[PDB]
Amino acid sequence: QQCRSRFVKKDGHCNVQFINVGEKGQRYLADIFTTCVDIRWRWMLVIFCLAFVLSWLFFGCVFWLIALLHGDLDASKEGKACVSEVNSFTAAFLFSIETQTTIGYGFRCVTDECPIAVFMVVFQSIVGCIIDAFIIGAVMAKMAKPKKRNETLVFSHNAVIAMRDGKLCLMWRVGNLRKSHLVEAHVRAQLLKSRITSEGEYIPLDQIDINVGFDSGIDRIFLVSPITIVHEIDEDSPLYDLSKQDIDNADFEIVVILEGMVEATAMTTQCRSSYLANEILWGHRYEPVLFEEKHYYKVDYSRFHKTYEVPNTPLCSARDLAEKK
Amino acid sequence: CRSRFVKKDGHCNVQFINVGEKGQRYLADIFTTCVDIRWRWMLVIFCLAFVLSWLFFGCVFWLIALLHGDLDASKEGKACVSEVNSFTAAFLFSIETQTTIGYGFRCVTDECPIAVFMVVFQSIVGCIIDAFIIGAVMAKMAKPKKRNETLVFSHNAVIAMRDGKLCLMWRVGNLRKSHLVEAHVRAQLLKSRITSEGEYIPLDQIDINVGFDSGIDRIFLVSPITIVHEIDEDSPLYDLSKQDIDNADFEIVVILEGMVEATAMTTQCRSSYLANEILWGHRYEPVLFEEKHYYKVDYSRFHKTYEVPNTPLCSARDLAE
Amino acid sequence: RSRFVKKDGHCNVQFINVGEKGQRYLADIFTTCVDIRWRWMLVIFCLAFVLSWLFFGCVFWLIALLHGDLDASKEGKACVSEVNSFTAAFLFSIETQTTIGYGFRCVTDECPIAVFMVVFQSIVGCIIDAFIIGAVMAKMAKPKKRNETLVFSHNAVIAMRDGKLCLMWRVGNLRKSHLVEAHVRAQLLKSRITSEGEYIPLDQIDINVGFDSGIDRIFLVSPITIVHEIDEDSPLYDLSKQDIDNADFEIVVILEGMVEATAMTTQCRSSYLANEILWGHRYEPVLFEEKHYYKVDYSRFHKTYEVPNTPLCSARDLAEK
Amino acid sequence: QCRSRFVKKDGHCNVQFINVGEKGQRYLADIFTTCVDIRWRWMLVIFCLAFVLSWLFFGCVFWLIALLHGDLDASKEGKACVSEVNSFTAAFLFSIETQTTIGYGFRCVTDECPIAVFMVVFQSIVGCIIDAFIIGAVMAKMAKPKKRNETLVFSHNAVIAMRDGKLCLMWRVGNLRKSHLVEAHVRAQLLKSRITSEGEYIPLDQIDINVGFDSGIDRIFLVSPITIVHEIDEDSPLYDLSKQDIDNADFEIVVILEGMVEATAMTTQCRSSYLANEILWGHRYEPVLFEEKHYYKVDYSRFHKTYEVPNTPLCSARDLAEKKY
C-alpha cells in the first residue's frame, strides 16, 4: 500500500514539503491581495476599526500638542485665539472626530491666530481621504473579484475494469449537481509507477500515460448527463499483462484529470482523484441511470456508487484472450 | 420523441430531479446572492437594513439621553447631547451623525465619554456598510452576460450531394462586424446501442469527423460558411435508407465555441437536429451579393433552401458492383 | 473577385435588414458606458444629478410654501427658518445632498414628514453617488483595447529555399513584451464550381504551416519568417507566372496571441493581394552583431532584394523528367 | 555566438529598438499605463499636489469674486454674501470646507448671489468627479495583480544521459510553493545559424525538439519534480553531434513551461537555456524526491547536483547506430 503522491482530494500530499532554502520571503512586500485572501471575515472588521481609530488618535494627539503649544496657554484671560468653545483633551477628541469624519458640528473653528492650522487640517484631510480609499479598495478587492467555489464536479469513486464490446476496458464516470455545462472539457488518465532502467538504477516515481483517445479527438465530452469514459486494452497499452493476483497484490495509482472551463468567470476549474488498489471491482458492470418520463426526461442521483453483477466474464489476463487465436 | 438533451436553444430539455449538496451560506451571500437579486428588492433590502441601523442607533442615544440628563430637567441641566426633549431629537441626531451631516443645531458638550465612544463606533459602522454597499452595487457592472449579437446557428440543415460524396451541411449566422477568436466547431451523434455481450445502453455518443485531424475546424468567420461532413467507412452514416432518415433513432447536436473580443468569456453555442430538419437532396441558396465598393449581405433568405432537379439516391459502392 | 472580407488590411462587409435582431433593450450598462468613452457622459451624468438636485429643491420649496402659506410668519416659528422660498429650499437641498452642514436653517419637530423626506433623499443621493462612482471605476479600470504591437509585412515573397518553392512572411514587434501561445494560420480565398455544375461564390482553403507536425508555436523575440513548403496537397501546385499576376486570390494570415499580464486574446489580420507579386525575392539579414551586443533594426523591415539566379517554374519536370 | 537567452529570463542584455516610432509615442494618452509605470514612491505626492492645486485654484477664484462683489467694496452695512472673510486665509478655509464637505456653520451665503450657488454646485460636482478619479486610480493597483511570481523554476544543471539503451537531453523542473498548475505545456527549441543549399548565410533560426507533442506526453501533472526525456532518434537534428562537437560548437536550447496559476486569469510562462557547457555528458540525477518513511516529503537541497555514472559509451549517435549492425 502507498496511499500518497496525489492532490488533497483523497488522502493528500501528507505533510507537504520539507526544510529547504524556502525563498518564500518578502510576504508583506506585496501583501495587498494575499492578506485579503488570508484575513477572512473573522477579523477584517476589527483590523479596519483599529487601524483607522489609531489613525485619528495620532492626529488628535498632535492637535492636542499644538493647542497646548500655542493659543490659550500664552494668556488664559480674554485672549481671542484658537481652540474656541472647546478645551483640554476632549477638545482634541472632538476636533479629530469632526475633521476626520467630515462632520460639521462647528463648535471649534480655526482662524488667523493659527496660520499653521489650515495646512495641518488640509494635510489631515488628504491623508484621511487616502486611507478611506485604501479601505474601500481592499473591501472591494476581497468581496467581488475572487470566486473560490469549485465543487459541482464529482468523480464517482467505484469503477470497473471488465468486458465491453468484445474487449476489455476500465471505465470511470463524472457527475454534476446543477446546470451551466462546461466548455472545452478535457480528460486525462495518468498512472503512477516505480521502474528500474535497463542499465540498472532505482527510479522512485514514474509517470505513464493512458490513451483515452487523445489522437482520436474523443475527449471534449458534452457533459449534461453522467458518461463513462473508457479505455480499450491493447499490446501498446502498459496494462496488457495483469492477473487478479497481480492487480490485487500490486499498487498503482490511476490519477485522473478533468480540467474544465466553468461558465462565465474565467476560472480554469480542474479536479483530481485516483483509485488505489481495490476500488476497481473486476466483473461489476454499471447500472442504467434512466428516469424516463412520458413528457420529456429528467434524472436523480438515487443509484450512484453501485454496480450490477455479471457472472460470465473471462477470468484471466488481457493477453490470455490474445493467446486464444 | 426522445430525451433531447439539447439545452434552451431550439428544442429544450435539461434538468435534474434530486438535490445534492447545497448550502454553507444563503447561496453565497457573496456573489450569487447579488446575482439573483438583480434590480428587484436588493435596494429595498439594503436600504431597510441601513434605516434600521439608524433606528437602532437613535434609539440607543435616546435611551442614554433620557437616562443621563432628562431626570434633572428644568433646573440648569448642563448635561451632554443637549437640545433634546423627545425621541425625534435623538433620531434626527443619529440621522445627521451617520450621514456625516454637520447641521450644528445638535450639541455634544463635554464630560460625556460614552457619547464619543458610541459616535466613533457608529462612524466606523457607517463607513464599513457604505463600503459594503458600494462594492455590492459595483458588481452590476462586472459580468456582461450575452448569448447573441454576431453568434447564432441555423434553423435549417440538410444532407446533399457535393464533390466526392453526400455530406451533412450547416452554417453559422452573424449579426455585427465583430469577429471571433479560436472558433471551435464540433458535432456529436446521440443514439441507443446494445453491447455484443448483451445489455441495454440507451445513451451513446459518437463523433462526426469534421476535420479535427485535417485542421479545418478553426474558421475565420466574417460571412456565413457551410461546414460539411464527408462520408467514409469510418463514418457511421455509411449507408442508410429513407426509412432510417425519416425514422427517429439518431440526433445530431452541433456545438460552437468562441471568444468575443475585449472579453474573457468562453462563449458556447449548441443546436439540435433530430430526424426532421435534415432533408434528402436540396441545396442552399447562395448569398450572392458581389458588387462594386458596396459590400453587403442579407440573411433575409438565410433560413431557406431550394431543390436540386435530379440527384443520386444511394450510389455508395455502386461502381465496384 | 474583389469581395474582400477582412478588417485591418483593407475593405469590410456590411449588413442589411438581417431581421433586425440586434435591438437594444437598454438593459446593458457596460456597453452604454463604453460607447460614449469620455466624450459626453460626464456632462450627461452631472446634468442628471443636478436636475435631481433641482427636483429635490422644488419639492422642498413646495412643502415649505405649503407650510409658509399657513403660518404666514409672526407665529411660533416654522419647520424651516427661511423667508425666500425658492433660494432657501434650493440651497438646503444642495447642502443636504452634498452633506454640507452650513446650518443656516433648522429642522425642528413640527415636520416629521420633513425627516422622512430627507431620509429618502439621502438614500437616493448615496445610491446615485455609488452608481456613478462604480460606473467611472468600471470604465476607467477596463483597458482601452490597444490591439497593437504586432505588425505584418507588405507583399508575398514567393521564392526558392532549400531547393523548393515557398511563400514566406515575417512579423514585427516594435515593443519588448513577448507573446504566449502564439498560433499562426494562412487561408486562401477563391471561387469554385463543383463537379455537378453549381456556383460557389466564396471558398476557403487552408495553407498548412506546420499543424500536425508541431512547428507553429513560435517564440517571438527576433523577427522570424514563416514559410510554407510547396507540395501536392497545396492548391497552387503548378501554374503560370502571368496568370497568378492576373489572378486575384487572397491570402489572409492570422497570428492569434496572448499578451503579457492580461486576460485578452489578441488577434491580427493582414492583406496579401495577388495583383502585385515579387517572384524570387529575398529579405535582408536583420540580425546584426555588435561584439558584446546583439541587435536587429526594422529600418530595412519593409524591404527585399532580388537574387540574380533562380529557377523559374522548376516543377517535377526538368528535375525528374 | 548570437542568441536571445543567456541563462535566465529577461536575458536580452542588448540595445532597445531604434528607428521605429509609428505607435510608441502616446504613452501619456492612456491612464492604465500611467498607473502601472507609477508606484507608491510618488503617487501620494501626485494626488496630494493635484488636489491641493485644485484647492488653491478654487480659493483664488472665490477670493477674486469676493473682491469683485461683496462687503469689501463698501465696508459699511452687513449686506453681503459672506458674514466673514475679508482676508485670503478665510476664503481659502471656506474653499477647504466646501471641497472637503466639512459643514462648518461659521459661514454661509446670501440669496442675492445666484452666481455663488451656481459656482458651489459646480464646485461640488467637480469635487465628486476628481474624488471618483482618485478612488478609481488607487483601486486599479490594489485589485489587479501586477507583481510577477516565481513559484515554478527550472534547474541550473542539465545533462545528456545514456538511458534506456538510447540517448536523451535530461532536464527537470521544480516547484517552490505547494500550489499546482493547469494545462502545463512544455517546449524545447534549438537556436542556430545555418547556410541554405544555394549558399546564402541564413541568420538566426529555430528548430523544434520532439518532446512528444504528437504522442501527447507533454501535459505533465506537476506535484513532484520530474525529468523530461527526448529519446534522440535519426529524425532529431542532434544525431551527428559527437563528444567534442558539443564542446567546440555551441547551441541554445530554450525551454518553455507555459502554465496556469490556480484560480486566476494569468498565462504565466518561463524561459531559460544552456549555452554550451552546462550540459554534462553521461551523469544521472539523485533521488531528490526521496521517499520518507511515513509519507512523501521532498527536499530541494540536492536539487542542483548530479551523480557521476561509472561507465557509459562515449561516442556519437551514428557511432552507436553503426556499431549495432
Ligand SMILES: [K+]
Ligand atoms: K495527430
Ligand SMILES: [Sr+2]
Ligand atoms: Sr463621502
Ligand SMILES: [Sr+2]
Ligand atoms: Sr483562456
